[PDB]
DNA sequence: GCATGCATGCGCATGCATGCATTATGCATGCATGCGCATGCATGC
DNA sequence: GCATGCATGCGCATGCATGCATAATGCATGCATGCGCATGCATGC
């Protein structure tokens with residue numbers, strides 16, 4: 001006889017029920033503790049409805065049930081549910097008021113083949129698969145214990161159990177003996193949670209030359225909404241045919257359709273630690289060095305992205321004057337400078353970050369529209385990436401390639417911080433409180449130092465004016481820097497084969513610190529110094545007009561304040577002090593100067609050396625001087641000789657003179673500094689020379 | 693005139709032609725709209 | 738004038754409300770007449 005035939009009869013049913021009850025009551029762990037005791041207790045503490053059982057323990061304790069389990073799942077699961085309900089109701093008597101049924105789910109199993117191997121042999125069996133979710137139908141109320149109203153009299157027919165295979169068709173009304181019709185009593189019916197899922201093979205495991213295959217699954221009761229589309233899951237289920245409509249009859253061959261019915265899915269002190277890290281005096285440098293571990297160099301960009309991530313504070317006196325606190329970032333770089341890796345890292349770190357590209361065929365669009373979704377076939381209003389990132393970050397790649405509509409939408413979202421829609425009878429305004437970070441390339445493919453930033457970029461001045469921070473990444477042949485970058489790249493390639501800052505914080509710790517600072521830190525400007533700010537602003541405007549190009553405006557000051565707030569948010573300071581103000585001054589001055597052309601940039605850099613030297617390193621400046629002299633000598637050698645020489649040498653007197661011009665008189669510490677050795681410089685006193 | 697016979701008369705059973713009562717479910721068709729395609733018009737540079 | 742963008746345009750699939758097609762058997766009632774009974778009329782002797 002078949003396994004299910006022996007299962008059906010009452011004798012072994014009751015015997016197996018008693019065996020399972022004893023297994024539940026007597027099962028203990030490897031340490032002697034009653035597993036089901038603690039399990040049912042923690043289930044009781046939250047009023048849950050499901051119980052989890054391992055096939056390994058079930059096979060170890062009672063082998064016959066484990067053997068019969070794969071080839072007769074439905075009846076055995078029903079018996080186990082009855083036994084578990086009896087045991088639980090014995091433990092606690094109140095569930096008759098709360099929950100009248102408890103489900104039993106199998107957790108572990110011997111792994112079963114993938115979606116390709118499922119064939120006729122696996123029908124009506126227990127299987128376990130792994131796949132990727134592609135769609136979900138939501139939550140649906142299915143019938144259970146249906147009550148029907150007669151339509152001739154008004155009698156209420158008793159509850160009928162709704163099986164998953166066929167619909168319930170009542171025979172006749174017990175009183176008037178009518179044959180129909182009947183309708184469902186909506187008020188007295190009981191309902192169940194139902195959801196449908198489509199699963200596709202993981203693209204990495206598909207052999208070359210064939211395509212991934214998909215199958216459908218059904219989740220019920222507590223399993224609903226346990227998976228998001230695009231995730232990777234593992235199911236334990238029943239491979240089924242016996243549902244009405246599976247046979248193809250209207251035309252074609254007699255082909256059956258298969259469906260899987262699933263029953264399991266397998267995918268305080270921190271505040272004190274945050275405060276302790278804040279107590280450390282150099283937390284700011286730790287955070288600055290913690291950004292983008294995989295990218296070498298570009299320390300200024302990481303420092304700016306720190307403020308961009310931490311953000312500021314909006315201010316709106318009354319309902320009249322709105323001032324944002326989001327610090328936008330724009331990057332312009334020559335090819336090969338890894339602009340996109342920064343955006344990828346930011347998306348990885350940020351809790352809510354949206355990524356899109358202006359070139360085309362983006363997964364998420366940049367404009368709101370109303371459409372019937374291709375997958376769910378529903379009439380939806382799909383807002384752009386700007387709307388979806390409320391209090392989040394929006395990332396745009398290939399900023400220049402955007403067409404007219406994208407530029408218009410971005411301008412509207414940046415200047416008004418709201419998106420207006422008038423389409424298909426729908427008129428709306430949606431909030432776009434988001435921070436914008438963008439990357440782009442110059443017009444000719446290479447940055448021109450003799451032209452302004454606006455002349456080098458395809459964008460317009462109004463769009464550029466919105467961004468608080470502008471960064472320029474220019475590629476220049478430095479042998480030592482190129483050597484280090486190549487070393488890092490080759491090391492990364494070798495490592496991933498299949499066979500200044502003391503210590504950066506952990507990524508999860510950084511996330512927790514960011515969340516805590518955003519939630520509970522609100523620095524106050526009650527200690528600002530207006531005299532110094534006003535004097536510096538006046539002097540900056542004066543010398544900008546003296547040079548005669550791109551004068552400063554009040555907007556920059558606002559950015560400074562925001563940056564100051566961001567810095568005060570880094571140290572968990574509740575009040576703004578002079579250090580944050582000076583750092584924001586340095587950042588704003590660097591951003592403003594870097595956008596000028598050669599002569600103006602040089603003059604401004606020379607004149608404003610006082611402010612730009614805040615918390616700077618003298619050794620770095622001396623290294624810059626040495627690099628400039630080395631570059632001059634190398635250029636002269638290449639132009640005259642026609643080829644480079646084997647050695648580079650430079651007198652110490654020129655370096656000393658330039659340091660005196662910058663008011664530096666001692667260089668022994670620079671000689672003993674690590675920066676001197678890192679660039680493979682040497683100093684010879686026998687000739688008073690520097691060799692590289 | 694009294695004794696007897698008896699053709700008439702009445703009520704309840706069965707047999708047989710007409711007549712009376714009952715009664716939801718499953719399958720097919722046209723309207724709306726997505727998706728791939730080629731022609732063609734209009735707009736730049 | 739030639740190169741490119743693109744709003745308009747067309748044909749065949751599915752999904753969903755209305756609409757279309759099907760289709761004898763069993764049980765009840767009144768008319769005709771047999772069978773037992775008591776009254777009553779008519780006819781003998």
Ligand SMILES: Nc1ncnc2c1ncn2[C@@H]1O[C@H](COP(=O)(O)OP(=O)(O)OP(=O)(O)O)[C@@H](O)[C@H]1O
Nearest residue numbers: 294295296297334335336337338339340341441485
């Ligand atoms: N400093 C760096 N550290 C690590 N990798 C780098 C660095 N600079 C460049 N790369 C590598 O250079 C490659 C160039 O690709 P990438 O997408 O990063 O370029 P991009 O700057 O976005 O260029 P494009 O202007 O073409 O969009 C990448 O594989 C990146 O890892």
Ligand SMILES: [Mg+2]
Nearest residue numbers: 339340397398
């Ligand atoms: Mg890129």
Ligand SMILES: [Zn+2]
Nearest residue numbers: 150153173176
């Ligand atoms: Zn009824």
